[PDB]
Design a protein around this ligand. Sequence first.
Ligand SMILES: *[C@@](O)([C@H](CC(C)C)NC(=O)[C@H](CO)NC(=O)CCCCC(C)C)[C@@](C)(O)CO
Ligand SMILES: *[C@@](O)([C@H](CC(C)C)NC(=O)[C@H](CO)NC(=O)CCCCC(C)C)[C@@](C)(O)CO
Ligand SMILES: [Cl-]
Ligand SMILES: [Cl-]
Ligand SMILES: [Cl-]
Ligand SMILES: [Cl-]
Ligand SMILES: [Cl-]
Ligand SMILES: [Cl-]
Ligand SMILES: [Cl-]
Ligand SMILES: [Cl-]
Ligand SMILES: [Cl-]
Ligand SMILES: [Cl-]
Ligand SMILES: [Cl-]
Ligand SMILES: [Cl-]
Ligand SMILES: [Cl-]
Ligand SMILES: [Cl-]
Ligand SMILES: [Cl-]
Ligand SMILES: [Cl-]
Ligand SMILES: [Cl-]
Ligand SMILES: [Cl-]
Ligand SMILES: [K+]
Ligand SMILES: [K+]
Ligand SMILES: [Mg+2]
Ligand SMILES: [Mg+2]
Ligand SMILES: [Mg+2]
Lengths: 202, 233, 213, 216, 239, 196, 234, 123, 200
Amino acid sequence: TTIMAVQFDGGVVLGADSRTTTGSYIANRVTDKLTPIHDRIFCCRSGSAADTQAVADAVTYQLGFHSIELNEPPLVHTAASLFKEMCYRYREDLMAGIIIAGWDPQEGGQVYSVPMGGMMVRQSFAIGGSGSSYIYGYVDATYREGMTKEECLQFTANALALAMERDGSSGGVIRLAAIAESGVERQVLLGDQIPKFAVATL
Amino acid sequence: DRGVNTFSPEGRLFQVEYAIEAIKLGSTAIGIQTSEGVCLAVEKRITSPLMEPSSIEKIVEIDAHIGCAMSGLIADAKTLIDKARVETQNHWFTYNETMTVESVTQAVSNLALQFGEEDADPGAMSRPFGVALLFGGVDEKGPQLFHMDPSGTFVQCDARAIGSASEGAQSSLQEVYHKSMTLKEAIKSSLIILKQVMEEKLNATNIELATVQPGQNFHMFTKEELEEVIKDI
Amino acid sequence: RFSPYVFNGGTILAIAGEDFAIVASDTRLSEGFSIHTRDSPKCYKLTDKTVIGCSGFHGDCLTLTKIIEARLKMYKHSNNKAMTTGAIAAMLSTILYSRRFFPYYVYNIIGGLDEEGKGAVYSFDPVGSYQRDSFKAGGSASAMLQPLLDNQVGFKNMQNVEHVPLSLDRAMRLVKDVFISAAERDVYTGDALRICIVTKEGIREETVSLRKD
Amino acid sequence: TQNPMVTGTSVLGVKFEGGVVIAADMLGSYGSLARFRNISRIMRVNNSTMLGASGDYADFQYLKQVLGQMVIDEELLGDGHSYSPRAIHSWLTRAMYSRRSKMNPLWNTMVIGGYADGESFLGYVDMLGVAYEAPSLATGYGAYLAQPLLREVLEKQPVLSQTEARDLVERCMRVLYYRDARSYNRFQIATVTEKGVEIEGPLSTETNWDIAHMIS
Amino acid sequence: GYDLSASTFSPDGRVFQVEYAMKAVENSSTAIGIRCKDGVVFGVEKLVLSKLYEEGSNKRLFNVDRHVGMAVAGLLADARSLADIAREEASNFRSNFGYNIPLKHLADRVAMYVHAYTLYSAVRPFGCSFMLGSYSVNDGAQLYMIDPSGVSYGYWGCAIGKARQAAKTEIEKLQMKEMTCRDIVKEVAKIIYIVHDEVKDKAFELELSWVGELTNGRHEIVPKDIREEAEKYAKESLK
Amino acid sequence: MEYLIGIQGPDYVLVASDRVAASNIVQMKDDHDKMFKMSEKILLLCVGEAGDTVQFAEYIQKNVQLYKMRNGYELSPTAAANFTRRNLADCLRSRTPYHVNLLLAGYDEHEGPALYYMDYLAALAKAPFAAHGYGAFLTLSILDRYYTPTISRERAVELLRKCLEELQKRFILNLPTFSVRIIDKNGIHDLDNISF
Amino acid sequence: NQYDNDVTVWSPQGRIHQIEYAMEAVKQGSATVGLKSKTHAVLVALKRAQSELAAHQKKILHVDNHIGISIAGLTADARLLCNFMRQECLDSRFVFDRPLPVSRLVSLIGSKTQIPTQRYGRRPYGVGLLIAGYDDMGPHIFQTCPSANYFDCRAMSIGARSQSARTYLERHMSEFMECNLNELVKHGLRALRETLPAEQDLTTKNVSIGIVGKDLEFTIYDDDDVSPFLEGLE
Amino acid sequence: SYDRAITVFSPDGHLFQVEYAQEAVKKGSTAVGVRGRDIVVLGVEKKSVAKLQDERTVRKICALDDNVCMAFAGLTADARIVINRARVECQSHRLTVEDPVTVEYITRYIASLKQRYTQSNGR
Amino acid sequence: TTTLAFKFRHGVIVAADSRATAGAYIASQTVKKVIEINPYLLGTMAGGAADCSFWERLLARQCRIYELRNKERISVAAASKLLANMVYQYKGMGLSMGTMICGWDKRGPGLYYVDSEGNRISGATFSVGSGSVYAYGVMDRGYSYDLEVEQAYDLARRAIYQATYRDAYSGGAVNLYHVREDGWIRVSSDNVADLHEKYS
Ligand SMILES: *[C@@](O)([C@H](CC(C)C)NC(=O)[C@H](CO)NC(=O)CCCCC(C)C)[C@@](C)(O)CO
Ligand SMILES: *[C@@](O)([C@H](CC(C)C)NC(=O)[C@H](CO)NC(=O)CCCCC(C)C)[C@@](C)(O)CO
Ligand SMILES: [Cl-]
Ligand SMILES: [Cl-]
Ligand SMILES: [Cl-]
Ligand SMILES: [Cl-]
Ligand SMILES: [Cl-]
Ligand SMILES: [Cl-]
Ligand SMILES: [Cl-]
Ligand SMILES: [Cl-]
Ligand SMILES: [Cl-]
Ligand SMILES: [Cl-]
Ligand SMILES: [Cl-]
Ligand SMILES: [Cl-]
Ligand SMILES: [Cl-]
Ligand SMILES: [Cl-]
Ligand SMILES: [Cl-]
Ligand SMILES: [Cl-]
Ligand SMILES: [Cl-]
Ligand SMILES: [Cl-]
Ligand SMILES: [K+]
Ligand SMILES: [K+]
Ligand SMILES: [Mg+2]
Ligand SMILES: [Mg+2]
Ligand SMILES: [Mg+2]
């Protein structure tokens, strides 16, 4: 797995590879790792498929109920807090590295990391999953303050493609989502649409 | 019908007031505290010559330094006596010392209002204890007599009677008591008073008597030792 | 394997006289090859007549002393008098045994006056075995202190010497000497020696400097 | 926590005349990876008290949540009583000991600094409930690299000015950046005086690499 | 008889035990709240039943969160119990969701707790009514009132206790939507003095609190000097 | 280490058990009794882990006696054996298993003599003869060689003595004396100890 | 009537008769007085003796070094509540290593004692307390009731004929803040003495005194130890 | 679980449930005991006769253990409960003391069982 | 530790050393290993010191309660059984205890061995502790039911002595008690260094 999210002025971009593995067998080559938690709040999942599905389902339930009770859209920070509470409390029984990202009317586009262990921190951009190791350098050199939505989408797709080339544990297609006040726009980059960088032959 | 934890308009618990009235159906017991020790004396109240008098036990040892005389509903007293015994042994176990008479009395008195029907365990106490108790003993404060009743109120007394004829007996105790009175005088005085108040002719089988002294452990008087004291009285 | 224990060092000592008790300890608190602080005494006042010395795992020393303090007040409230030195010792035995299967990693020595006004020392293992002693060393350097006390206070292995009563002044000299000797050889014992002297007049305090290496 | 995940390295503290200063870098490491490079490892508890934590950051965040809520609860009463630095240090000792005794520690080592009633307070609490006070403290590699320098200065001059304590802390942070492979050259300094608690940062030390040309 | 348990309806569909609990609130001296342009102000007529009591004793104004005040009437031990419930609810909300409880949600949660004590022979209804007040830049000023049945509504102005109707008629004279907290405190003090029956109950303390732009959204006691000025204004206005 | 043996004839059951209680390298008692009277015509012989053995046997004993007091008549040997088995098996997977091996001997008015064998797992077998302990390894073949179902009680005591002499000759442990009892229509009889 | 046996039954006037009845238990106890200055808090109690040969019931109890109480009403309820107070104080020293502030302890009593007033088959506590304490905010006198209400007091008296004591305390309370300790205790004794029949006087057998302040842990004076305070009521 | 207080005091110190239990005993068949020099004897009345009854099944005299027996008067179902409880207790005593009960020991046990059912909720 | 006891015509002899150890460190030479349960009943201690002291002190508590409740002395059988039933629940949890319960009751002189493994047995003679093997040898070669009182004291003292000689973990003093029909008495305390002088 490689997961990523990036803030821009008015929203967020999220991205993931699509590979589920047991050992080195690919059990699903087109996994959807970006799961909607509410109308404008998604989570990117890494670690155990069972654990992250169970936790995402439970948070969807909690956040939904909370939202109906308050009669307002939920805060991105609230969604992240609910993940954090569950990931921290059950840290000894879960293997879950989560990014929560979305939009709300109060604070705009926001990205939160909830890594294994269940800490929570807001970030400009976040990467996670085992493939993320191979793109720390790339993201650190390429990130610029003030990127547009379209630039965040390219930045994300590039980072993910590089990770997917090098990490045996990541691959398949790139799933992207952009979230803003106007809604959610999803897309898939496959085959020739995935950014390409040569193998350095002699 | 009302609940067991209902207050009357005078600010008393009905059940406790009624338990106090049950003490008046008991045989008379007397306690006297002197500088030489305490004595406890009780009317047995034999109801048939076929009854074994030694099977009536209204004075009991709590520990070597502490005895207890009871009046009222005697069956109720068993769990209180056992709690007193267990507490003094716990205190010995934990602290390697004897428990004070006051402390024993306090421990028992904390059971008193622990009744009621919707706080507690599946079959906890439904009512107060219909018992009054005199604890007589010796500790580092010297000789000591304490009284306790079903309200959980306890207090030190120089001399005290409880049961049916306690008014009466308490009046004679005011008349004869003095702070410098000897134990042998106290023993005689309490038998003289029991003799007045008892319906039956006093003798060496229808009373019990015990002492505790600074020298000497809890001691129940034998038939032969009672006969000796009865001669003068 | 999280371990719930660590060893923090500390040497303790108590001596019973005819009308006094001494309780003494070094003030170094250690862990591994490091010093946490040079000013952490191992003696705690319990009553006007009783002092306790505690060494071993500092987390347990702190907890146990706070438990003892609460229990002394509970006793005083239920019984209307302060706990005697003997009753504190008996109670500590039960508190230690209550953790028989997850022990307090603490070596305890009580020093105080008994009910006749005489010096009393009680020594403990971590699970609450105890007895009265005439003198006792405990903690990190106890095997260094104890033999000299056996010899000099107990007169052991000596012929042709009068078995005189232990004066406070000589007891004091011995206490300082043995800690000075221990500071030479036990890496954990050092910085300063704190001495509490319990008498009928109260508890007073002396401190003596030790090597800082 | 059985297994710490994202962790913080050393925390330093030193008393000075009129207050206490503490220092900590802004790094959460994930094993050797310098993963979260802008996190604060210092908390203002209330007006008289501050706290710095080494070890597991999620466990620190939990303590911050609990302790923050405790201060709020107390302020609601509006009754003229506040938790002193010593009280907070006591509470923390109990909490860590209690979690140790359940075999489920909070995986942290903490430094509590405060100023109340004319007295500087500086106290340590570790994950096992080992707690004490001292004129200077340093957790982690700071115990080996910083504490020797703190104590040597304090022996020559037990009473430091604020500016002397601040310069001494900066020298220690430099050493730690040279020699601790989990450190990072972006830190905060927090100070407590009569006036309250101030947290400054992000700060950096100057470094010298002349020795790179002294090998042949 | 049909009025001994909260688990028994009367033949006309009333729950008399809840009505009786309401009568305890209606025997109590008066508390008022007023929402205005930039906050909420509370005032209580606090009857002093003995001169031996300290100034401040038996407060009827509470902080239930840093941003939320509570003003009570009725049986004071019941009210304090509810303040503790409100505090626990605010605290738990912050722990679980990670931000300050919105006033309306706090009002609704405590009202459901009150409501739970109106269904059963096992417990009795609370003998208290209370107001909750807050301010924030996002939510503006909010004032809610909750009664022993567990009903909860929002208000521009509100009064509870024995001179409730007389207080409401004075509150209706203010254009509170356009006034500031500093203006409204004087009018709160004025209204308490108007509805106070100086013949029947001899001595009272005025208790004042507020939350608004001027306190940065923190619920706080009105400062002493401002309270004294408001009292002086109220007294002279009585004339 | 502990030896039990039983031999059932036409109208009696003969049983014996060693009398040693050992600990580490020493015999601590040489007159130990491993037999428990359950009722007038039932013996339970119990060996195994210290504590478990007495705790288990005395619990069974008290309950068999309770059954008598409640009902006016005794459990049969077979009912008592099945009761014993139910208890052991029910404890096997509990927090309190009992590590004991047993023989149950009895005489029923209507069914005649019975000998039952039980191991610590609570497998129950009726047998014409049986034995427990390491000593069983050296004596069961002697029983297979010489036992017949009509064996008289004299010859059973002779056969028993062959078994016990074989332990003296061949077994590495010092088991010098044995308790011997017989059960028949007239109850439980003590015979002389067999000693070396 | 149908309204007076259950603490869960409101009367049609908005009252709870069981709570009012519990308050009668305190009005019938022997009188006790509490008062304070800038530096000390004092309790003074009359002790009732059953017969001429009984000791006289304890009225003043130690809670912690900085807190003591005087009781009126059911003695067993007084002990239960005193044990709760003691435990709350011990907890605070254990956790925080500092004394529990007096006003926080009183809040805990209010909250604890309110609970049984709202549940079927439970009863109020039939005891009233005067609480003397000293903390960072100085000396305190608090009063607690069977209703679970409590009061912060300049001075107070509860129990039988305590109206007289309260009248004395109002008359002299402008003097209390500036009193030395001896003056303050004398004022307590004169207030308590107003509760007595004209024949009878304060003696070493019937007076109990409790004192706490800046320099003084909570201390109880009984029997021969009250004599210094009784001599010079001149 | 049913926790009603059943045995309570009345004005004048009476426990009416206990007094009514004693009325039940007074309507039971007569039972008599005499302590001899080296024998003890129990005899009991009746109760019904009735030719079609199996006599064995209604005895009012019962072994508690080998060395202790009892007779009762009153509610026969209640007696069966008490008897079985006492029989269990005799086996605990043997188990933990390795002596048979004294008659006073098992009496004291039965009496305290009875006392508990005058002071426990729901019974 | 070495402890022993034996029944004979004139009651029961009980003897012990006085050493305590923590590994190879000698922690004390003055431990009392014979505990006074009541005036006619003694318990002996071998194994873990805290374990023996705690459980025998609890035994003493229970025996005293028994006496108050039943109005008679507890038997040696019943006392040993109470102790066995208490420790049985803790088997496998690491208690280390080996005790002899020594008294005189209605069946005459009484002696039971009880331990943390669950054993409880009556017998004529026992020795318990790391030095027991050495004590058994000398006790066994001198024991008789018909020993005179002074010969019985001599045997007990000598058996413990010889154990202290061979066993690194036994030493200090030999403390000797005699349970008689009217109570136990303390008979002697002899430092092993003084016995060495005497027996050569
Ligand atoms: C991802 O972390 C990925 C994310 C997951 C949310 C789809 N994780 C997995 O594929 C994990 C192993 O890490 N696999 C599973 O949980 C197993 C699911 C099926 C199990 C049976 C086939 C036995 C990456 C980087 O780990 C993907 O490689
Ligand atoms: C004894 O068995 C002896 C008997 C005991 C009642 C004193 N046991 C011990 O000495 C045991 C052996 O581990 N020691 C302890 O329980 C710890 C004693 C105190 C340690 C200090 C740290 C105070 C013999 C044979 O084991 C004696 O050697
Ligand atoms: Cl998935
Ligand atoms: Cl992660
Ligand atoms: Cl991750
Ligand atoms: Cl992963
Ligand atoms: Cl794939
Ligand atoms: Cl009476
Ligand atoms: Cl970061
Ligand atoms: Cl902060
Ligand atoms: Cl209203
Ligand atoms: Cl009173
Ligand atoms: Cl009362
Ligand atoms: Cl009130
Ligand atoms: Cl009053
Ligand atoms: Cl029962
Ligand atoms: Cl010795
Ligand atoms: Cl018993
Ligand atoms: Cl045996
Ligand atoms: Cl051993
Ligand atoms: K790949
Ligand atoms: K050293
Ligand atoms: Mg799992
Ligand atoms: Mg060094
Ligand atoms: Mg087992």
